[PDB]
Amino acid sequence: NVGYQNGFTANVTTNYSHTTDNSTAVQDSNGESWNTGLSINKGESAYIN
Q: Which residues bind a copy of itself (CB under 8 A)?
A: 1-6, 8-15, 17, 29, 31, 43-44, 46-47
Name the minimum Å distance from CB 49 to a copy of itself: 12
How far, in Å, CA of 17 to CA of 21, rounded? 14
Name the minimum Å distance from CB 18 to a copy of itself: 11
- Please choose, from the candidates 19, 3, 21, 22, the residue with its C-alpha nearest in 3D space to the C-alpha of residue 11: 3
Name the minimum Å distance from CB 13 to a copy of itself: 4
How far, in Å, CA of 7 to CA of 5, rounded? 5
